[PDB]
């Protein structure tokens, strides 16, 4: 996160750090708890990931230094990538991780509500992007979870900023015209959380952008409302 500040412990209790064990253990992507055995994240996180066996989901983490070999984590039973996904820039950048065990909800770890289909018309004015990603183009993964408040931008405005790309209605953009605050490397897969009627909703999944916090280059996110039926298809399968 560029231009953000340290989060307080328990502030984003749906935020997870997805680690890979191959070749060595390191933070791979962000993710969000959406159900007791479900993590919603970005499909691009799994490029070259051959098996869910190398993955570890850590919930209730503020600092990456809390993670040692004796730290508990959730194993991943299954990686579900949207079957229309080709690359982040073309959309369908959404994946579900089915966990091997059940997340016990509490003050440090709980789910974020998905957006309502009826709420596709609501104007979100209090949106935050969170993650352990870089604070500048060439940096390193941060120890403390960062947060930044970012305004949502219309798709017409986002399309003007991305000449040569196709910004679809299954994408949502967020950023300041002058830049300064944005997601950066290592934040991908994490949430874009918006507060509406005292309830936080998972509005976006951090996906892609041209650089980090550049003027007239907003962060591009998977527009979660457009995938509610796909999430329910996968999580409520009989
Ligand atoms: C010690 O562990 C350690 O260093 N981990 C670690 C370090 C660096 C990265 C990283 C590097 C470069 N790109 C990314 C991802 C894409 C990806 C995801 C997973 C694997 C490979 C690529 N893309 C982004 O985050 C975007 C989001 C939207 C933004 C909008 N302005 C622009 C940047 C991550 C990940 C983990």
Curated annotation (Swiss-Prot):
Active site residues of this protein: 44, 93, 188
Binding site for heparin: 160-163
Residue positions the entry lists as glycosylated: 63, 104
Disulfide partners: 29-45, 127-194, 158-173, 184-212
Ranges for domain Peptidase S1: 1-236
Protein name: Coagulation factor XIa light chain
Lineage: Eukaryota, Metazoa, Chordata, Craniata, Vertebrata
